[PDB]
A paper describes a structure:
While PP1 exhibits broad specificity, it acts in a highly specific manner by forming stable complexes, known as holoenzymes, with a host of regulatory proteins that direct PP1 activity towards specific substrates and localize PP1 to specific regions of the cell. During mitotic exit, PP1, in particular PP1γ (PP1 isoforms include PP1α, PP1β, PP1γ and PP1γ2; ≥ 85% identity between isoforms), is essential for histone dephosphorylation, nuclear-envelope reassembly and chromatin remodeling. These PP1γ-specific processes are mediated largely by the Ki-67:PP1γ and RepoMan:PP1γ holoenzymes. Ki-67 (3256 aa) and RepoMan (1023 aa) bind PP1γ to form isoform-specific holoenzymes.
In vivo, Ki-67 and RepoMan bind specifically to the β- and γ-isoforms, but not the α-isoform, of PP1. We confirmed this in vitro using ITC, which showed that the affinity of both Ki-67496-536 and RepoMan383-423 for PP1α7–330 is ~four–six-fold weaker than for PP1γ7–323. Deleting the last 15 residues of PP1γ had no impact on binding. We then tested if RepoMan binds PP1α differently by determining the structure of the RepoMan383-441:PP1α7–300 holoenzyme (2.6 Å; Figure 1—source data 1). The structures are identical (backbone RMSD = 0.22 Å), demonstrating that the isoform selectivity is due to one or more of the six amino acid differences in the PP1 catalytic domain (residues 7–300). Only two of these differing residues are located near the Ki-67/RepoMan:PP1 interface, Arg20/Gln20 (γ/α) and Lys23/Arg23 (γ/α). The change of only a single amino acid, R20/Q20, switches PP1γ into a ‘PP1α’-like isoform (PP1γR20Q; KD = 2239 ± 124 nM; ten fold weaker binding) and PP1α into a ‘PP1γ’-like isoform (PP1αQ20R; KD = 199 ± 46 nM; similar binding to that of PP1γ). Although R20 does not interact with Ki-67 or RepoMan directly, it confers selectively through its interactions with PP1 which order the L1 loop. Namely, the Arg20 sidechain forms a salt bridge with PP1 residue Glu77 and makes a planar stacking interaction (cation/π interaction) with Phe81. Neither interaction is possible with Q20, as the side chain is both uncharged and too short. Remarkably, the R20Q mutation abolishes PP1γ localization as effectively as mutating the canonical RVxF motif in RepoMan to RATA. Together, these data reveal that the isoform specificity of Ki-67 and RepoMan is not defined by residues in the PP1 C-terminus, but instead by a single residue in the PP1 catalytic domain, R20/Q20 (γ/α).
Author numbering:
A (entry chain B): 391 to 423
B (entry chain A): 7 to 299
The structure:
Amino acid sequence: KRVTFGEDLSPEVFDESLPANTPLRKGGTPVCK
Amino acid sequence: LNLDSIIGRLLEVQGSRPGKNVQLTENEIRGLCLKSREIFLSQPILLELEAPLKICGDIHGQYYDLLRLFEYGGFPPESNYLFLGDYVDRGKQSLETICLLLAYKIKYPENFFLLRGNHECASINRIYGFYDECKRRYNIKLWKTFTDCFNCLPIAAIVDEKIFCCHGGLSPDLQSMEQIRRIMRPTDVPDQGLLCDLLWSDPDKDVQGWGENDRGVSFTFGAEVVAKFLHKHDLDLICRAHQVVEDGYEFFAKRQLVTLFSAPNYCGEFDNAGAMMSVDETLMCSFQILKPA
């Protein structure tokens, strides 16, 4: 059981003036290899 | 202790205009400290955690960014969480930050974990904001209550016997994990020793072995030190925080060490993004980044 690294994920973009539950762009979610 | 009422009020500002405070009562916060302190002491000082899990770096009182991190990674108990310390100081809302994390710790004691950072120390948070925030919004007595709670925080964690987690880094005094387990709680952070290094030491590319740290506290360590440590304890990765990085995360010594920082636009003096390491059941580590516009 060794440590590996997944693919790069699109970052969740947010605005500081906007509510925490309403990001500008939803970020990527880790998926299977 | 009405934990659900506390969490509810803390999460209530999720869709509100950012910046507004959540003012809990003195007794509610004191209750959070007392119960969490009990759980911290009942659980090992060296945690043995299992994947899947999400690991976060410094938060530093940036409460609304913490909500954004949960908005991205999933609010508990949807996901497991391990924080590497530094929840207070520098930010404008250290109280809201630590209260939610302590509430989640009490609410989900087996799926939510908090490590001790160097800012979870009375001598440190006295200076960099937390004391002033307590004196302003509550009282000095409550600050001492937080101190008594911080002194019982676990120091390190190991994920599936492969990922070693701490706030700072390695120590020249660390030959066996037993030395960490032998550390008695409650305790303050000393100016020197194993406990000091685990919360203060940093990796350094230009250092062969161990060197002096420019902070004036603890040490620096090179890539060879990391490699020897992993091989000796059959580990694959060191996961730490303690240092602000532009992309929110940064590898060291050929992906044998990673630094996590989860506070984007760090106290209005940086344009850095925040990041978070997601570890699945196969110990495959992904990096979820919270990036400012």
